[PDB]
Design an enzyme around this catalytic site. Structure first.
Site, PDB file in Angstrom:
ATOM      1  N   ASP A  30     -41.475 -23.660  13.012  1.00  0.00           N
ATOM      2  CA  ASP A  30     -42.482 -23.420  12.137  1.00  0.00           C
ATOM      3  C   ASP A  30     -42.620 -24.416  11.088  1.00  0.00           C
ATOM      4  OD1 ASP A  30     -43.832 -20.679  11.097  1.00  0.00           O
ATOM      5  OD2 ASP A  30     -42.954 -21.566   9.062  1.00  0.00           O
TER       6      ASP A  30
ATOM      7  N   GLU B 179     -44.846 -25.898   7.539  1.00  0.00           N
ATOM      8  CA  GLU B 179     -45.716 -25.627   6.269  1.00  0.00           C
ATOM      9  C   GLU B 179     -46.585 -26.772   6.346  1.00  0.00           C
ATOM     10  OE1 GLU B 179     -45.316 -22.808   4.827  1.00  0.00           O
ATOM     11  OE2 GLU B 179     -43.050 -22.326   4.700  1.00  0.00           O
ATOM     12  N   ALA B 180     -47.963 -26.365   5.513  1.00  0.00           N
ATOM     13  CA  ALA B 180     -48.883 -27.564   5.482  1.00  0.00           C
ATOM     14  C   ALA B 180     -49.530 -27.511   4.260  1.00  0.00           C
ATOM     15  CB  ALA B 180     -49.880 -27.451   6.636  1.00  0.00           C
TER      16      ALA B 180
ATOM     17  N   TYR C 198     -51.735 -22.597  14.570  1.00  0.00           N
ATOM     18  CA  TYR C 198     -51.144 -23.350  13.135  1.00  0.00           C
ATOM     19  C   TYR C 198     -50.195 -24.673  13.758  1.00  0.00           C
ATOM     20  CZ  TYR C 198     -52.706 -19.191  10.470  1.00  0.00           C
ATOM     21  OH  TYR C 198     -53.507 -18.074   9.913  1.00  0.00           O
TER      22      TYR C 198
ATOM     23  N   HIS D 142     -39.138 -17.761   1.540  1.00  0.00           N
ATOM     24  CA  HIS D 142     -40.569 -18.295   1.923  1.00  0.00           C
ATOM     25  C   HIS D 142     -40.513 -19.720   2.246  1.00  0.00           C
ATOM     26  CE1 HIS D 142     -41.480 -14.565   0.002  1.00  0.00           C
ATOM     27  NE2 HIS D 142     -42.512 -14.657   0.676  1.00  0.00           N
TER      28      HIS D 142
ATOM     29  N   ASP E 294     -38.552 -18.641   7.984  1.00  0.00           N
ATOM     30  CA  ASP E 294     -39.724 -18.147   8.866  1.00  0.00           C
ATOM     31  C   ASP E 294     -38.912 -18.310  10.475  1.00  0.00           C
ATOM     32  OD1 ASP E 294     -41.439 -17.218   6.990  1.00  0.00           O
ATOM     33  OD2 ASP E 294     -42.611 -18.882   7.264  1.00  0.00           O
TER      34      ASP E 294
HETATM   35  O1  LIG Z   1     -47.272 -16.247  10.287  1.00  0.00           O
HETATM   36  C1  LIG Z   1     -46.848 -17.513  10.025  1.00  0.00           C
HETATM   37  O2  LIG Z   1     -45.927 -18.224  10.575  1.00  0.00           O
HETATM   38  C2  LIG Z   1     -47.996 -18.544   9.563  1.00  0.00           C
HETATM   39  C3  LIG Z   1     -49.124 -18.003   8.782  1.00  0.00           C
HETATM   40  C4  LIG Z   1     -49.886 -18.787   8.201  1.00  0.00           C
HETATM   41  C5  LIG Z   1     -49.742 -20.107   8.281  1.00  0.00           C
HETATM   42  C6  LIG Z   1     -50.657 -21.242   7.400  1.00  0.00           C
HETATM   43  N1  LIG Z   1     -49.836 -22.055   6.512  1.00  0.00           N
HETATM   44  C7  LIG Z   1     -49.291 -21.049   5.367  1.00  0.00           C
HETATM   45  C8  LIG Z   1     -50.551 -20.794   4.502  1.00  0.00           C
HETATM   46  C9  LIG Z   1     -50.857 -19.447   4.597  1.00  0.00           C
HETATM   47  C10 LIG Z   1     -51.951 -18.974   3.653  1.00  0.00           C
HETATM   48  C11 LIG Z   1     -52.709 -19.894   2.992  1.00  0.00           C
HETATM   49  C12 LIG Z   1     -52.304 -21.131   2.921  1.00  0.00           C
HETATM   50 CL1  LIG Z   1     -53.517 -22.223   2.206  1.00  0.00          CL
HETATM   51  C13 LIG Z   1     -51.604 -21.506   3.688  1.00  0.00           C
HETATM   52 CL2  LIG Z   1     -50.968 -23.664   3.876  1.00  0.00          CL
HETATM   53  C14 LIG Z   1     -49.294 -23.128   6.940  1.00  0.00           C
HETATM   54  O3  LIG Z   1     -48.594 -24.013   6.214  1.00  0.00           O
HETATM   55  C15 LIG Z   1     -49.898 -23.851   8.067  1.00  0.00           C
HETATM   56  C16 LIG Z   1     -51.091 -24.194   8.187  1.00  0.00           C
HETATM   57  C17 LIG Z   1     -51.602 -24.944   9.243  1.00  0.00           C
HETATM   58  F1  LIG Z   1     -53.001 -25.284   9.273  1.00  0.00           F
HETATM   59  C18 LIG Z   1     -50.678 -25.435  10.190  1.00  0.00           C
HETATM   60  C19 LIG Z   1     -49.455 -24.987   9.869  1.00  0.00           C
HETATM   61  F2  LIG Z   1     -48.510 -25.640  11.032  1.00  0.00           F
HETATM   62  C20 LIG Z   1     -48.932 -24.416   8.989  1.00  0.00           C
HETATM   63  C21 LIG Z   1     -48.588 -20.753   8.953  1.00  0.00           C
HETATM   64  N2  LIG Z   1     -47.830 -19.594   9.533  1.00  0.00           N
HETATM   65 MG   LIG Z   2     -45.911 -20.258  10.280  1.00  0.00          MG
END
Ligand SMILES: O=C(O)c1ccc(CN(Cc2cccc(Cl)c2Cl)C(=O)c2cc(F)cc(F)c2)cn1
Ligand SMILES: [Mg+2]
Ligand SMILES: O=C(O)c1ccc(CN(Cc2cccc(Cl)c2Cl)C(=O)c2cc(F)cc(F)c2)cn1
Ligand SMILES: [Mg+2]
EC number: 3.1.11.2
Lengths: 214, 214
Positions: free
Chosen positions: A10, A12-13, A119, A174, A179
Site C-alpha cells: 500500500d 500514500e500519495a 492506485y 490511517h 492498511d
Molecule cells: O483502498 C485503498 O487502499 C485506497 C483508497 C484510496 C487511495 C488514494 N490515496 C488516498 C486518498 C484518498 C482519498 C482522497 C485523496 Cl486526495 C487521497 Cl490521496 C492515495 O494516497 C493514493 C493515490 C494514488 F493516486 C496512488 C496511490 F498509490 C495512493 C489509495 N488506496
Molecule cells: Mg491503498
C-alpha cells in the site's frame, strides 16, 4: 507456477490519480505462501495473528510538490512535515532498496494491493519510469485484492470488508502499514482459497502501464 | 554535532554471544530527532503514540546453523522454520539493503539498542566482517539504551523499565520489531532529556569490535 511470496502493498500519495500524484509513503509486507497454505496450529482469536516470520519495509518519501488538503487529511502526511523529518525523494537509491528487499523473497513474487490497479501499481510504475527504470519490476506479478475478494465473496472498502469478516472495525491506523496489516488479516480469513485465486489470476507487473508519463 | 536520526535497533540470533551466534531477525526503526525534540500537540494517552513519520525495516535471516532450544523458545524462530519461509542468509545484498535504508536517513545517524554493546552492535559488526565489509558502518554512531536509561533514572530489562514508566506491561510481542517499538515508547517518556544524553554520549560505530572473528 505457484506464487512463493505474496507482498502486501500500500502507498500514500499527494493526491488522486487525476492530480498527477507522487508517492509520500509505501509499505511492503512480504509473506511466504507457507504462512497462508500451512499456518501453525494453536490451542481461536477473532482475527488471525500475522505470521511470526515476515519481512516488512515502511518508508516515507518526499514528493516534489504539495499534498492536496484532502490528501493530507486522509493520509496524515504533508510535504512540509515530510521535509521536517528529512525525507528524501523517490530516487535511484530508493529503487535499489526496493529491489534489494524484493530480492530477499523467493520468486515468483506477487504484489497484492487494494484497488492496486487504480492506485498503487500505476503510480509505482510511473515513479520508476521517471527514473528511467521502466523494466525494473518486470519479473514481479501483481493482483488487485478488490478483484480477488469480490470473486471470493456491498461496499468493498477495506474497512467494510474487514467488518463483514471479523465483526469489528480494523485498528485505527490511517497509514500505509496499517492498511497493509488489515489487508493481510482479510487475506488470512480464507487463506487457501485466497492463495488459489492469486495463483490463478496473477498478472505480470510489466502489463501495468504507468499512471502518467513525462 | 547533534544526531539527526535515531535508529532504534534490535536483533534476534541463534544463541547468546558465547555460542558464536548468527542473526535470525533484525528491525531498524528510524526516527528523526524532530519527533522527539518537537512532537506535535494533541487535545493524553498513558503511552505516547509512535510518530506518524518513521522508516521501518524488519527482516528475517537464515543463519548458517541451528538455533539453540533456549533461543527458539525466547525468539519464536528456528532455522528450519526460517528455511520453510525461504529466508536468505546474511549476504552482500542484505548489507546493501541495510546501507540503502540508512542512506535515506539524515546524518549523523545513531543506532540505539538495549544492551546493544553486548548483543546487537558486536553481532552486526561480526556479520559485516564475515562479508569483508568491516568499515561499512564507520559513519554511524551508536548508544546502548541501558546505559542511557540508567543515567537518566532496579531491573533494567526492557519490560521492567516500561512497567515502571507506564504502569503496565509492554505489548505481548516477542519479536525484534516488538522490542524496537517498546524501546521507542520508553525513549519518548522524557524525549528531550533522552535526546540530550544521546547527543552527549554517541560513540562511533567503528569503535565496536566484532563479537567474533574467522
Ligand atoms: O483502498 C485503498 O487502499 C485506497 C483508497 C484510496 C487511495 C488514494 N490515496 C488516498 C486518498 C484518498 C482519498 C482522497 C485523496 Cl486526495 C487521497 Cl490521496 C492515495 O494516497 C493514493 C493515490 C494514488 F493516486 C496512488 C496511490 F498509490 C495512493 C489509495 N488506496
Ligand atoms: Mg491503498
Ligand atoms: O534486552 C534485550 O534487548 C536483549 C536481551 C537478550 C538478547 C539475546 N538474544 C535473545 C536470547 C535471550 C536469552 C537466551 C537466548 Cl539463547 C537468546 Cl538468543 C538474542 O537474540 C541475541 C543474542 C546475541 F548474541 C546478539 C543479538 F543481537 C541478539 C538480546 N536482546
Ligand atoms: Mg535485544
Amino acid at each position: 507456477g505457484h506464487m512463493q511470496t505474496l507482498i502486501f502493498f500500500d502507498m500514500e500519495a499527494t493526491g488522486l490519480p487525476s492530480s498527477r500524484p507522487e508517492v509520500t509513503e509505501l509499505c511492503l509486507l512480504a509473506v511466504h505462501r507457507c504462512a497462508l497454505e500451512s499456518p501453525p496450529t494453536s490451542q481461536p482469536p477473532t482475527v488471525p495473528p500475522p505470521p511470526r516470520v515476515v519481512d516488512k519495509l515502511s518508508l516515507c518519501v518526499a514528493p516534489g510538490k504539495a499534498c492536496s488538503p484532502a490528501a493530507s487529511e486522509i493520509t496524515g502526511l504533508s510535504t512540509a512535515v515530510l521535509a521536517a523529518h528529512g525525507r528524501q525523494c523517490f530516487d535511484d537509491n530508493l529503487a535499489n532498496l526496493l529491489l534489494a528487499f524484493l530480492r530477499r523473497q523467493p520468486q515468483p513474487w506477487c504484489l497484492v494491493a487494494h484497488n492496486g490497479d487504480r492506485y498503487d501499481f500505476p503510480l509505482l510504475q510511473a515513479e520508476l519510469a521517471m527514473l528511467g527504470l521502466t523494466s525494473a519490476l518486470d519479473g514481479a506479478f501483481c493482483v488487485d485484492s478488490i478483484t480477488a475478494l469480490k470473486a471470493l465473496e456491498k461496499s468493498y472498502s477495506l474497512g467494510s470488508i474487514y467488518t463483514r469478516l471479523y465483526g469489528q472495525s480494523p485498528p485505527d491506523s490511517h497509514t500505509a502499514e496499517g492498511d497493509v496489516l488489515a489487508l493481510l488479516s482479510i487475506c488470512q480469513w480464507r487463506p487457501q482459497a485466497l492463495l488459489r485465486w492469486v495463483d490463478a489470476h496473477a498478472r505480470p507487473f510489466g502489463t501495468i502501464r504507468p499512471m502518467y508519463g513525462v
